[PDB]
Design a binder for this molecule. Structure first.
Ligand SMILES: *C(=O)[C@H](C[C@@H]1CCNC1=O)NC(=O)[C@H](CC(C)C)NC(=O)[C@@H](NC(=O)C(F)(F)F)C(C)(C)C
Ligand SMILES: *C(=O)[C@H](C[C@@H]1CCNC1=O)NC(=O)[C@H](CC(C)C)NC(=O)[C@@H](NC(=O)C(F)(F)F)C(C)(C)C
Lengths: 292, 300
């Protein structure tokens, strides 16, 4: 069948640590001799206050533990890189894998390893939406949880949790310390970009339905529409211009011959399905549906 | 938010191993000094041929390796328990956690750690259906992959994969060697019982939609139907008798309160949706999903 595929959290679990600073506690990941955690554990500051507030944070206050290895690390250097803190410790993590800090483009998926007190409690699947927010699930003390993927032996880190917004949305930074979207780690109302459907993922979801549930459903459109006529419709109906990624076409084309339904009909079905309308319609990437 | 939550797989990766027997390769789990793996690694036998074929199987032909620990295991004795092989090794797994073999009932969820060659490649979420099948995703060499849950420190093993049927459905045994349902590890057509929706889980899906997507969607029924009037309809529309588990009512009654929508409207919505859905996408699904359990939607 066709399922939402997640990446095994084992390599991330061995690197997770807990970071507690003067009553505030969150999570952090431990790679080589550096621990990466959100900067707001030292306090809730704004704008350019961070440089100076990090400069006076004494390392003896950074209590860092890695429960899965039963060792308490000692901080020696503290450096702010973006909106993250790089905590240099004496002990090198023997469980460090070959990794890479890869930034996500909107529409791509990743595995969140939701962690509390330095221990991963849940893992689940999210996709970065065009508003640069993820629709996830976090409670107090979850900041520092990472979103990742895996390509063979290499851990690809994409995300670290920072803040939750009113409409059940979440934003954080990449492991280089830069937020996704115009969002910051400040507890104020922040304007969001209007939502837009990642069209390639909507098309991938419908094809997954025809390949597993029903080869010919009733709501499927009988007539085609051109990509051009769809893209003119999409510019006024909050749908992204198709195709979002030119590299998704070889997947979608292969999916359409497997399903014996040209993408023109799927696009038309998307337009006809606007009668029936957060939404969760873009969790299925064309790669994940085609490869499996 | 309300998400499909999987259990962290690191405990299972440290215990996974690969078992190869005369060109046949599949996975296995290694707890204490015994390896568990499906019995058809020694051949594709039928009926009661297993006990004789296992008793003549040379332990020197079992090539067992644990790639995450760099250990190659040596098999002392082999005994068949149910449809599973228990391969005694000379080395105790140091990473063995406190575990328990717990058989699932239909309607309950578990995390599948899909492995190949002793290494888990994908983890995903499935729910045991009333036909005692799971709707999963497996290729050749994936047998031996386990489904599991975690309650704090104890690892709860529920399932080990053995066979895939034509309609993209999968079956296997619990870790005690007994299949779920009347299915066996033989490559012939086996009658499956008709599909039936786990009503408690479909109720939990619509409640999940009301709590994170849209509180008052256009397809939510305005009128109610009683549980009994629903169960009369359920017997003719492939829906289980509500409730499937009495223990789900404490969760469902909780979801009713915070959503300000009683379960009677959810049940009447289920009935209306079977005739006037026309492509509505509930919780990211164009289908009735049994993947959302009331406990998972209510707890998180
Ligand atoms: C870090 O672990 C916590 C966790 C939050 C709370 C539950 N969901 C989460 O992800 N993050 C914060 O408390 C964060 C601190 C800032 C200094 C970064 N603040 C928030 O997420 C707040 N949100 C806002 O005030 C908002 F931005 F206006 F939305 C709440 C109110 C604590 C959620
Ligand atoms: C063990 O690793 C595999 C897992 C399979 C491979 C394809 N998808 C899976 O989940 N088990 C088998 O290949 C199994 C071996 C028997 C001796 C138990 N055979 C099958 O699953 C076959 N299915 C049938 O013949 C069926 F029962 F009629 F459906 C196929 C045809 C190889 C899938």
């Amino acid at each position: 069948g066709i399922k939402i595929l997640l990446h095994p959290s084992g390599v991330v679990e061995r690197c997770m640590v807990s970071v507690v600073y003067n009553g505030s506690a969150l999570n952090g990941i431990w790679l080589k001799n550096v621990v990466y955690c959100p900067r707001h554990v030292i306090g809730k500051f704004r704008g350019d206050q961070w440089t100076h507030m990090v400069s006076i944070a004494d390392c003896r206050d950074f209590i860092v533990k890695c429960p899965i290895q039963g060792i308490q690390l000692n901080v020696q250097s503290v450096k702010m890189v973006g909106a993250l803190l790089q905590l240099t410790v004496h002990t090198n993590n023997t469980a460090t894998p070959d990794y890479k800090f890869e930034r996500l483009q909107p529409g791509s998926s990743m595995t969140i390893a939701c962690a509390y007190d330095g221990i991963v409690r849940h893992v689940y699947h999210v996709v970065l939406q065009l508003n640069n927010l993820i629709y996830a699930s976090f409670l107090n003390g979850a900041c520092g949880s990472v979103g990742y993927t895996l390509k063979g032996k290499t851990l690809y880190l994409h995300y670290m949790h920072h803040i939750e917004f009113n409409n059940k949305t979440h934003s954080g930074t990449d492991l280089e310390g830069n937020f996704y979207g115009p969002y910051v780690d400040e507890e104020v109302i922040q304007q969001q970009t209007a939502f837009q459907y990642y069209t390639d993922n909507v098309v991938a979801q419908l094809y997954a339905h025809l390949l597993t549930v029903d080869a010919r459903p009733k709501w499927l459109a009988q007539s085609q529409i051109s990509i051009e006529d769809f893209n003119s419709w999409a510019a006024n109906n909050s749908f992204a211009n198709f195709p979002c990624e030119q590299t998704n076409m070889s997947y979608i084309m292969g999916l359409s011959q497997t399903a014996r339904v040209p993408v023109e009909r799927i696009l038309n079905t998307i337009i006809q399905l606007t009668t029936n309308r957060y939404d969760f319609e873009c969790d299925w990437t064309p790669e994940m549906v085609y490869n499996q």
